[PDB]
Amino acid sequence: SVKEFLAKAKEDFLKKWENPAQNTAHLDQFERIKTIGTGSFGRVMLVKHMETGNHYAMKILDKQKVVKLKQIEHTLNEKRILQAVNFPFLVKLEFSFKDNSNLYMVMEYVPGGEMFSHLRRIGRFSEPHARFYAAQIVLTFEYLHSLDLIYRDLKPENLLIDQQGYIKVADFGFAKRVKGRTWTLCGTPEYLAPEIILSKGYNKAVDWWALGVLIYEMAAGYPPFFADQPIQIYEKIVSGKVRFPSHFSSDLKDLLRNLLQVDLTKRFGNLKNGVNDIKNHKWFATTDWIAIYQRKVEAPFIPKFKGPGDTSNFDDYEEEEIRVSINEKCGKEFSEF
Amino acid sequence: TTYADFIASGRTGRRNAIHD
Ligand SMILES: C[C@@H](N)[C@H]1CC[C@H](C(=O)Nc2ccncc2)CC1
The missing domain is CATH 3.30.200.20 (Phosphorylase Kinase; domain 1)
Known part of the structure; x- marks a missing residue:
């Protein structure tokens, strides 16, 4: 279906x-x-x-x-x-x-x-809150990628919260319809996959890496790789050693290690099973994907x-x-x- | 803490996209 x-x-x-x-x-x-x-x-x-x-x-x-x-x-x-x-x-x-x-x-x-403004103010989202938003992004990427579209700038700044507490992705300034690979260096420093930084020729998998960055930032309050200057950020990305807050559930970490995966043969979203590798993860076991799509789940936060x-x-x-x-x-x- | 390191950093505001 x-x-x-x-x-x-x-x-x-x-x-x-x-x-x-x-x-x-x-x-x-x-x-x-x-x-x-x-x-x-x-x-x-x-x-x-x-x-x-x-x-x-x-x-x-x-x-x-x-x-x-x-x-x-x-x-x-x-x-x-x-x-x-x-x-x-x-x-x-x-x-x-x-x-x-x-x-x-x-x-x-x-x-x-913007999600950014609420995330910065409050500090971090609870795992259930972050999962609610993350599920929306998963389905949106499932949709865009099926159209051969790569979005290429996922970050809280681009995610608008509507009157029902659900997300609208905005700013398609770098979105591209491409079937094979592409090479343009674009995106936001904190969210770039190593293959972009390394000038390799990449595909829709960069968006699943960026999802990994987002989920982590929503749950932690800060991104996995940060520094004062982008070059310092790129260095941390291509090492790929990520530290998780002790408060992250073991499921969250395991999702994230499969999203923030330098190795394209192991990075979720990219593999033979596609997006089901994400959807059927244990971090997402309470997620009702059809109910998220239909806007039937109760939003954890409704803006004034x-x-x-x-x-x-x-x-x-x-x-x-x-x-x-x-x-x-x-x-x-x-x-x- | 990592939180404190972030909050003291120059990149807690809205982050611009890059391009060559
Ligand atoms: C940070 C930038 N990449 C960009 C994110 C999206 C934003 C916007 O369209 N906001 C918006 C759209 C519709 N309704 C309310 C706000 C413009 C600035």
């Missing part, structure tokens, strides 16, 4: 992949309220659609800044992928468009904040909701103007956007 879900899901994805939605709104349809996020390229603002009174989150990219950062192809990936996908724990793209200066992706507004359009679950950011030049920038580079 998982096989059957995913085959129908692939058919859905393919139609949208081969014929992307394009130019489905305009900047002037929106009232910009507040900047709720930055990076890894551009910024994301709470906006309000006049015609429905709905709130959305609008990502804006400056086309010239994208060109300078050699993110053209990645930005086209991001929008082409995001418009095509559909899964409960993936943030939804409602509209995309562009003007002379910028690209815009209007997503659904997820008011609950002060109203529609409330942004108090996000940090405050410097506000930048949206400049729209009279001359078209980078027309040809972004023609399919």
